[PDB]
Design a protein around this ligand. Sequence first.
Ligand SMILES: CC(=O)O[C@H]1C(=O)[C@@]2(C)[C@H]([C@H](OC(=O)c3ccccc3)[C@]3(O)C[C@H](OC(=O)[C@H](O)[C@@H](NC(=O)c4ccccc4)c4ccccc4)C(C)=C1C3(C)C)[C@]1(OC(C)=O)CO[C@@H]1C[C@@H]2O
Ligand SMILES: Nc1nc2c(ncn2[C@@H]2O[C@H](COP(=O)(O)OP(=O)(O)OP(=O)(O)O)[C@@H](O)[C@H]2O)c(=O)[nH]1
Ligand SMILES: Nc1nc2c(ncn2[C@@H]2O[C@H](COP(=O)(O)OP(=O)(O)O)[C@@H](O)[C@H]2O)c(=O)[nH]1
Ligand SMILES: [Mg+2]
Lengths: 408, 429, 441
Amino acid sequence: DTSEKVKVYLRIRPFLTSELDRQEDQGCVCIENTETLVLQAPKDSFALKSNERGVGQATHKFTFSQIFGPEVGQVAFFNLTMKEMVKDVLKGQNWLIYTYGVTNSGKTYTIQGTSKDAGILPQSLALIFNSLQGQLHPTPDLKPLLSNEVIWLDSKQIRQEEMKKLSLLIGGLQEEDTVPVSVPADIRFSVWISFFEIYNELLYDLLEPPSHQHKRQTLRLCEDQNGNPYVKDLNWIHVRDVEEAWKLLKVGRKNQSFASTHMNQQSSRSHSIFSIRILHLQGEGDIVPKISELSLCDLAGSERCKHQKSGERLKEAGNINTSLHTLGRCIAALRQNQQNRSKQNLIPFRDSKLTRVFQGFFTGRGRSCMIVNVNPCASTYDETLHAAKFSALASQLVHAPPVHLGIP
Amino acid sequence: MREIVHIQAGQCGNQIGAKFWEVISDEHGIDPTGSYHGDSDLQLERINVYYNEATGNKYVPRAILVDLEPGTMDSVRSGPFGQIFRPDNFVFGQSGAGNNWAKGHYTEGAELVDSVLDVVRKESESCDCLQGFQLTHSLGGGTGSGMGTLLISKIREEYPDRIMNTFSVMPSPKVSDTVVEPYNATLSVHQLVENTDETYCIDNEALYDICFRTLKLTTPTYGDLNHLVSATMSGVTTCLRFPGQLNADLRKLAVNMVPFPRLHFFMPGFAPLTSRGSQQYRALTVPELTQQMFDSKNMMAACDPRHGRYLTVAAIFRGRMSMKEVDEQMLNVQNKNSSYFVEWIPNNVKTAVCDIPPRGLKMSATFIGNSTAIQELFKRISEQFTAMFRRKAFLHWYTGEGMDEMEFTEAESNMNDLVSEYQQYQDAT
Amino acid sequence: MRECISIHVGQAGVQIGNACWELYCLEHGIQPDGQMPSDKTIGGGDDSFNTFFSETGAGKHVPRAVFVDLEPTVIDEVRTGTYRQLFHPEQLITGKEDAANNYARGHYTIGKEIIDLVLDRIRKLADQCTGLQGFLVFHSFGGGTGSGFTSLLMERLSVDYGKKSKLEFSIYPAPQVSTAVVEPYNSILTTHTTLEHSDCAFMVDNEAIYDICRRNLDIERPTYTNLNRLISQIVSSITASLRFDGALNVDLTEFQTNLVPYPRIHFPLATYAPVISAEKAYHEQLSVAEITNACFEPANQMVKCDPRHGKYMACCLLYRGDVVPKDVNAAIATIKTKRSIQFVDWCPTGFKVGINYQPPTVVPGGDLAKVQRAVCMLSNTTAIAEAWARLDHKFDLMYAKRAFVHWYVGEGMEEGEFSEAREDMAALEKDYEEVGVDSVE
Ligand SMILES: CC(=O)O[C@H]1C(=O)[C@@]2(C)[C@H]([C@H](OC(=O)c3ccccc3)[C@]3(O)C[C@H](OC(=O)[C@H](O)[C@@H](NC(=O)c4ccccc4)c4ccccc4)C(C)=C1C3(C)C)[C@]1(OC(C)=O)CO[C@@H]1C[C@@H]2O
Ligand SMILES: Nc1nc2c(ncn2[C@@H]2O[C@H](COP(=O)(O)OP(=O)(O)OP(=O)(O)O)[C@@H](O)[C@H]2O)c(=O)[nH]1
Ligand SMILES: Nc1nc2c(ncn2[C@@H]2O[C@H](COP(=O)(O)OP(=O)(O)O)[C@@H](O)[C@H]2O)c(=O)[nH]1
Ligand SMILES: [Mg+2]
């Protein structure tokens, strides 16, 4: 490869009027260049100038593949990042999107959200569907259950799936490209979607509506004939237009677990995985037509456990932390798997459920990419630093000559 | 207070449990009836780590016997220490697995796991604060391996934050008394790595070697092997029940012994061990105990540490002794044998000291080693496994119980990965 | 009144507290049951001095102490031993599960629901104190409760009280000897506590005290009971001036003002000079000059380091017994004459002297011989930086490969904190390198 690395992408949310008046733009974050960021603590009058044991500046430089400031719009941000990746997916390859952030980082705004200012998810969905417009099979006849195998549907099974999706859509219903077609009139493109989560290292589906208080969706992680892993007994839904898929994901996120935090706010406590699989079946069709998987993973933000130390949440908090740590190690191995070093190392993907589910893409069956969204406000500065330490390609300490006070 | 719930499955598990409970009851001065006829006051200070108190000052152990088929029932209940156990904890069935992992895991054990889980929940709910569970069983067998793995899975699903400790009797390479050992061993090893906190590997060849070469016994029986394993089990958790200068528990041993989550396969050992006639010719001191522990011929795992490197070791001493001598001896062992210790851990040896020794001894010590050489015991098994799976030697028995061939292959891969995960650190770096 | 409150955290804390309170009870004539025959016999004086004891109506004397273990096996020995009737029943065991040598457990997940009880007990003790104040915190790096719970406790104390001295007595890890593999993580993660909140921190090493016992007292096979006794002697020498009369008294404020040049530099080294056996108590004069010289020997230090490799920035000599200022001044002059002992240019005086009339007491069963005079030296030197640097190296060897990190991460702690702690240590080390440089005109 041409030094792929993992192609991290940092996005800075613009300041809000409701927060700028509170004196949050303290110069903590500023873009040195499109490849480097510098982070500075809220020192001087922004914090208590008294004492300050060696915290005069506390400046840290971080290296990123690309940094996108507030000047970049939603469509502009999507076009320069994911459009090439959407093209690569419609070619026939697979892809993933890791997304990391904290409250006020705007990751939920970046990936999904307002219909007008479409996020990464709806924009990619629209490009994918507009690209294959006029190449949709008349009916569903095939399930992408496994990453390399298929299940055939009869008329009764097709009707049952139709009833399933109709019941899922009608319940909880509120209000909240073609020109570069790969190969029309020779290969039909069928699109299926699934959505689940990891929670306390237990897998749980999300397309199943709230059947009962108990979440008896403990999906088991099996391995196929070739040893590739796969979640067992996961629901998949055929989609005919962009609005159906988007609405199904709103229902899935509605089912998604949420919990309060140490402010008057609510946030996710699970690693949610969304998957869209495109079956390319040529006129011949043969068996198990080509399959192309695009996945997105919204990761629970790492949060400190001192302020949160009340209730059982602490438990899941720890679990979340552990999972993310393992993920980082895997990425580090993938940043050493590069021929850059000759020793090489084993990727410890088996140490957690989340890494194990993504086995083929650390092994080399696919390509992965990461996004980190950051709140530039000073009050969250420490959190931003942690996010940088999770996602930075490299870090540098300028050593800050004004630091080391007390001593003359 | 920290309480341990004990589970034992299969013939081997039941026999080890019987000997272990005899040992512990003698340690705490408990007669076969259940009454306490000891002398020291410290014996009752922490007796409820293992026992529950009945009405008339009678103590009943927290023992659960998983598959006490009548063949093993009549041996255990009619023994010297059979009446001590609660009758309701004797869970049992008929028409056992018969050296078939599929029967233990899917067909027969699945019909009996619910009662065992009910008893386990009843026992655990009756405790003040649970430290963790303790399992004894044998791989290469039937009901033992299969239903022990099933119980481990269910228990860790129900009680994830507690400690899951297992004493597994591995199948020896040469001393074999069953033909389908590799299949059950491979599947059990696949199940254990994902669902246990610490697992001690015991091999019958090593215990026979200890009986012959060290204790000079001419006609050893399974009683002596159970005796050694029971001594190890008592020595692991000595500091949970008695005071000492430097305390430890199962969690503290685990944190100091597992650098990464999947590397939790230990080799246990015990000292002193000498013949009856040769005890008068050697003085009992800390250097002698350290020398005997770190010797390669004393380990119960049937793996030579000299073929690998010690990722991390732990020593629990029992008896009145000096801390300086212990620390100096461990430092000397580390310095003199620097080839057999990983460089990226500056200090590999954890030390704990307990004041109260065993009943008849002046000093004693228990060793828990974690080294890469353990991979050897897997590799042999894997070899035998493929020698039977390349041609489907006895595969139809397992597939006739509703268990696809893929579950075999997956297990192989996982086991192989574990071996590879232990091979990184043998190479100097 | 002249009063202090002793906190002891962890197993090392509890055992050091046992030794210390044995020594205090013998010093003040208090029986193990709290009664004093001497007070009734004489009918005057305050022999149960308020520095360490509180008098109730019936003549019983209660220690001004509280210790916590998170592990009942240690403090239940106190509840059963000979001193069971001395302490208040508020010896806060909450050890349904210990910290398992994990800083995160002691600090985040199991340290809570116990901190409130500790703070309530400390508040109740402090309300009884109508006079001077100062906390004495005993603990050990390398453990979970000794590091995490100490961090949380000091963080809360610095907010609740603020302008009160908080002296520390820490069992620093040894350079080679150890009893754990995850020791450096806990030791380095305690830097924030011992820097921000502590006002003065004394560090001691087990290897150094083993060497002292082996060489001076001729004990071939010592145990922790001797180490704790020596540490108790040091602590009693520090706080003697608050209890007994003397020619020159040194309060804790006087102690800190003459020894802490800058706020970030509060890590002195301790030494007890006349450590000697009963057999070797003879054949020696044990005059002021000899003990003052012995305080400066590298071999007698209580931390494994070499003051010859660094520079002395301030010293506090505290004498007890048949001592006179004249011989003390002569000894300081002789020490100043020597060129093997180097002093920074920015401290031309570099000596604080305090004298107390009460000679040290001998504990029966102890291995220290009865003597007429003694001296404790507490000296702030840059050589202590060495004792940190070695430890840092060990930490690096375990953090490059991320060994043992998942245990800390899964108990509610970010990974980045590790790096933060290391950076803090580096900064402190650099400071100790920069104060020792000679002035440039
Ligand atoms: C003095 C003498 O002539 O006999 C001693 C003895 O010193 C020897 C013979 C004993 C003896 O050990 C054996 O012969 C033996 C045989 C098979 C398996 C294990 C041991 C002894 O049986 C073992 C026994 O050990 C104990 O008493 C411990 O408390 C031990 N007890 C049990 O395990 C036990 C088992 C069932 C019922 C009651 C107690 C123990 C060890 C660790 C933790 C708890 C308890 C002792 C001192 C002896 C005899 C009796 C000969 C030795 O073993 C132990 C454990 O001490 C063998 O190496 C030591 C040293 C000696 O050779
Ligand atoms: N000098 C001295 N050191 C001690 C004593 N007791 C314990 N230590 C030291 O304490 C260190 C480990 O601390 P721990 O035994 O874990 O006690 P802790 O700090 O409370 O941690 P926990 O075990 O979780 O309670 C060891 O390195 C010992 O050297 C003592 O009595 N004297
Ligand atoms: N160490 C030891 N091993 C035993 C004992 N009894 C049987 N075994 C071993 O256990 C294996 C047979 O397992 P088994 O007990 O039949 O399992 P089960 O059929 O599920 O009850 C063989 O490899 C034996 O060597 C014993 O008392 N001690
Ligand atoms: Mg402890």
